[PDB]
Symmetry: D3
Subunit: 287 residues, 6 copies
């Protein structure tokens, strides 16, 4: 009895195409924080493992048969094996945080994993019960769910960073939160403009709030919940109801405001530190 | 939109049909905005010094004949030119070497931002050809020996970056082309890349040979002159004429090549005609620049500079309190020093057991626990999984409150063993595989004896010194006790299947009788349908009683108790 | 012919019945009373025929339901013709003002049933006022219809007492529904809200166990026995079985007063 | 309290594309029966509401996910809500026939609705229990199920017709009956030449009657009933079985005869007027 | 390896039986008087054929249980059970040739052809929901159920020592009547003392006498739609059947068949 | 009548076919020199047996289509198709008895025993998800697929007019190699350009050469449980096979079998 059947689901999701947002975020924060390549690689490994475990778990709780155009992990190893592997990967990550040689890096891990799980709990509750949240309740959840890994990486980086640069944490954390919000709203737009699992999104809440009497949209959102999915004509009908409440332009306004905030925070940090980053300005032009 | 604009550059007159014995029949042009080209290269020189270090080897500037991209890319648009020449200067110094990592990534991103801000689709093509070149150069042995010219040429096509420069020309031309035409043109353009590469070998040889004779650690070189040494051993200057001729064949090779396309679509396909005609313009530019570039002749470098100078946890702690409220028969607390330490260890054991039970009920599809409904029937499957994932993190903090550095590692290693055991159990349950007796007994030493070993190894660490040797004995006792619990649970469930779980009696039944098809068929029916009904369960028990596998189990229970 | 149209209607009219509607049925001549009893009978039969389909109930009075002997579609068609036949029956009563009474009361009944069906399907819990207004139309609509039709064809005199009798009918229907809520859990398979359930979910805004069990019931087609007992325990702890008996007493008090 | 959940399925199907046959029929009848515009609009509303209710109900009892390329009413609101809204539209129309200022218009409504329900009941029986009707039996079912609305509109249109014109009653009833038969034979022919719910048709009865020993067709007609629907390869086999028996030519001949009757009736009616 | 082939064939043999075929074989041996080894051979043939028929019938009716114990296709699967049932016919081909008579083969093949025709009509009426007439139903169960008895008796008359051969038509008639009686008995017992939509003798009478009973016809179709009926609907069917005298019309058939059996047996003693 | 018994058989006979059996018989006839009437009888036997085999296989494989046309059990049902296949097996026994040879039945019975044994092993491996060895797989496919060829060969040699002394073992070896080649060819064709979880030479080589490829085994179990592999999973299986080198192994086996085929044909040509 040694290994395999445990790391197998973990290795399958690692050998898959990936954009590399979090690794580039770490490498762009290193320009401001200046860390040895050893520590940067360790943090990158931590981030990679965490993201892989998150994707493993989120694919099971979306009934998604495919990922990146390739079969998901639970369609090759079973749901129970994937759950076991994703459970182990959190123990494996805490073996890496301890190798960063700091007692204060464990408290950060154990205090932001709490926030990640709290956000995902509300997401799952809303999805299962079919209860529409408010805009505040939805924006505070995605700031604690999609912007939790970024906050982990930030607050750990500004802890191993050689003394001096510790007053940058507040701005560097506001940047992480606004980036998480931007990344969630961007995906929400991309899926819609260019609900089968009954996942709420920023466009949908505006539609269900502005029109408290649209009995047609709420009927399709229940047909999806009962039948288990929306076929193409019903998806077209839903996408059409969102182009009459102005829910594809409200999202654009939010996206523009968020990007303005990101640009302003980057400029403030670049005026406080020195020469242009040029590495956080490229992950922005790629949105 | 597919016609080359001749007003952007003017033809350069030459008195001889060839250029130093090269490029007969080619016509040379020089761009009309050389003032823009020099700006980009000087920017890279300033930035490279700021971010990386000082330079010495000169680059692409040549004051007498003109800029590299000027003579090599004579039809580039004026608005795209400065960025184009910026990349060329980078390519020169990057090849040389191949805070430092910061400057390298900052500069790799300053220019890769200019490219993607100008033309998103075509800049998407160029970066792969770059990535392909840097990957291929590093992944190819520089000590590799080349047996023939054809073998070397295939290496040299990607080494000198002729496709990379080709991608650059398309970006400077606004020419976008599909995949289908690409398969048409590789044999057409293949001689051109050889001509470009060999000329670079021929002209750069003198300084490279000087670098050779300076560098005594040299393996086989990537160089036509030096590699022709192996095949037709002779004098370098005489070889230069030989190198002159073999390249000169390629000078007219691609020149003629076109015919192939011209015959096919070189009379109607204007887009490829202009593309393959511009590709013909590359060969003369390289030699004209390479006649007198500072990149090969360091002695004019001083002279060259002279002229050039002018909300809440209510849905997270929802399944974690329901499973902690159902009736319990606690045997782990009984297995468990100061009072508060014992209470902390009992809390840890309780939380770990609750998480294990929550996960176990899902992977058994059991709708009932202690007569009461299961956790995933009150809170769903996904929420229970999410809470079972935070229970580990919650236990993780409780361990740290038992202040000791070494209680951390014990927890991590013990949980690794638990997960390995559970993974083997799950693999055997799903992929219809009957384990051996040794494999089954070793699996239950980790999946079931893991918690006991964890608690014991923590309490021996927390305990006030005194007890020294009571580590091996207690651990062995914990392993045998977990085995006894698992075998007992296997015995109780049968004498006084619905999820296809292998038990201790069942393994004996399937092993002692290698030919019993009824038991295996009923097991497969359980696998397929989902569970077994009462008559089939009675059939299974009858088979087990006939096989004498129920008294084989009681021998294990009595023997395990004797060890305890 | 008419064998495949009158089939389900004949079958549902042969099952044993409580006959409260006929007992409910002003000095009127006998033939008018028989006519009104026939109207009430066929209307209740159509209501039961449609309700059995919208609740997936295999059994009615222990005996099989109509849609398990004739099919869903034929039962629906027979119910529609049952409404048409009630229309024909009211016509034979020969009174021009009963026409509007019947149409208005039918509209109210359909509104009430529409709200009930929307709440059941979409998993939206109404408030106390909304629930107590829906059951004044879905269940008290028949009593109000019969009372308003009975008053009009009564010899003069009894004409100013229409309001009193209508209030009595509404409160009576409310009493029947609140009783049927009590004697259904103190003695969910279709995720039907009730008075105790509304009290439980309103008084406790953070009880996630009850809401989770209800959601499990929704995407299962019904609850099995242990979870039903869990729901009963939650209601009995919340004090909703006793909050219902206060409504039942208050309604009976108003019945006595009215 | 409100109407948003009652008049939601009714309004959804009333915002869909339509052909307008039932309204062009009223417009065409208005020539021989000169009528005020207000009454014509009332009757058009009546016909539209009845057609909408019929379409709403015949989509639940056909397990049809889509209608005119757009999602059906029961896939947006639910089966029970659609049924509840459809049984209310019968009451709503019953208030509109009452606004035509004629006691006799209610009897016509109450009789033709009975005939429509009888026809639909027989069709539902033959669909549920896979019992093949005779050609005559099928031709009497569709003279009520489909021609019922036309007859209903016609007989409630010669009643408000200003005096004089009452003699053109039987002729128009025959015209409506032939129109109802034709509009169903045409739909069967279009559906075939250009069974998923196991519905009989005029071409499919001739095949089962002329060939009493065709065991292949009678088993493909049962696979659809059992599984729930036929695949394309089985549909091709059914079409090939029907083509060899000459059923399509029989359908074309019936269509031709029906159109001859329609033109004869029209020429006679314009002759009288 | 004859282990995944003979497997299902031994499970169905291990199960308890009633031994009606063996008793029938013993029954006609007093009149036909033939040696013991041939009797054992014939009994083995009959046992194998009956086992194959039961194995195939259990699959074609979705019966999880048989004799209280689980069916063969719930221990070995459907495909292996079909394979073993198909091999049992080939095994019976081997068994018949050892009887040392060329005509036994022709008799066997003809009887199996009749048996398969009867079973085919049964399956067609079950799947398509077509109610047979009384004549068609009695013709079918005369071949499907009386086929084995006719096979055995026609082989017995051939094997038996010379002399008695004119008593072959009488015994064939006896076998047909006995099979008919057995099938009607099974129908009556299953009714008084159609989860797979089976047409029985009592049900045909009810469906013929009352050509307008929509309730029974709708319950029969719900059976098809749901693949079985629950207890209340079965009670409804039983009530419908005893309001048309379909239980009292079956006892008359049983009594007439028993009278015919008694007369045939008596006549079979006056020539012997 | 036999409209419900002979229905499925006629339907599957009407379907387009390749004609491998008839061509093989015609090819052997040049060496054996049988009269035309016997050759047509043998072609009829081969056609009936092949049609019955396909009828049974389509049911036991959950194949909804055959040659791009609806399968027999999708037009007549499972039970009727099973009954028709059993009657087809019984029918062939009436055809092999018109060959005027007592020895022509022993061959039929023994080759049918071998055929059923092979099919039983295939069914057991498919249902239980057990991977056979290459030796076991090749032994099996030598009997299931090389069964009809061997049966036809042996019967032709028995009926062959006089002579034909040594030409029995060589022809049986040819038949076995031919059946093996056909099965491997079908395997290669199906894979190159799992729904029922059927094992194959490329798949066995993969599962044996890689004793720790968990991904392939997981995808196979997903196919077993779900009921079939949707397209990207099948491409993943093909990628695993290409990585393991199974396709080249299959091609080598194909070539090595064709060498024996050529040598056997050369030798038999040389003798005759």
């Amino acid at each position: 009895l040694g290994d395999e059947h445990l790391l197998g689901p973990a290795e399958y999701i690692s050998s898959l195409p990936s954009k590399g947002v979090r690794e580039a975020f770490i490498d762009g924060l290193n320009v401001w924080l200046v860390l040895p390549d050893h520590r940067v690689n360790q943090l990158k490994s931590i981030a990679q493992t965490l993201h892989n475990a998150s994707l493993m778990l989120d694919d099971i709780e979306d009934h998604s048969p495919l990922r990146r155009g390739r079969p998901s992990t639970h369609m090759i190893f079973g749901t129970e094996q994937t759950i076991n592997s994703a459970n182990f990967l959190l123990i494996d990550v805490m073996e890496k945080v301890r190798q960063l040689d700091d007692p204060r890096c464990m408290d950060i891990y154990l205090e932001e994993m709490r926030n990640l799980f709290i956000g995902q709990s509300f997401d799952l509750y809303w999805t299962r019960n079919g209860e529409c949240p408010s805009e505040e309740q939805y924006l505070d959840m995605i700031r604690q769910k999609t912007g939790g890994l970024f906050r982990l990486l930030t607050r750990m980086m500004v802890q191993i960073a050689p003394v001096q640069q510790k007053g940058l944490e507040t701005q560097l954390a506001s940047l992480s939160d606004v980036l998480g919000e931007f990344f969630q709203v961007r995906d929400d737009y991309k899926n819609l403009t260019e609900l089968d699992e009954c996942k709420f999104s920023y466009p949908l809440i505006h539609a269900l709030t502005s029109q408290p009497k649209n009995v047609q949209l709420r009927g399709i959102l229940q047909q999806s919940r009962s039948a288990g999915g929306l076929d193409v004509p019903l998806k077209e009908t839903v996408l059409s109801h969102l182009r009459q409440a102005g829910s594809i332009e409200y999202t654009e306004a939010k996206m523009g405001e968020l990007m303005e905030k990101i640009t302003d925070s980057v400029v403030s940090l670049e005026g406080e530190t020195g020469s242009p980053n040029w590495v956080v300005r490229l992950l922005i032009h790629r949105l």
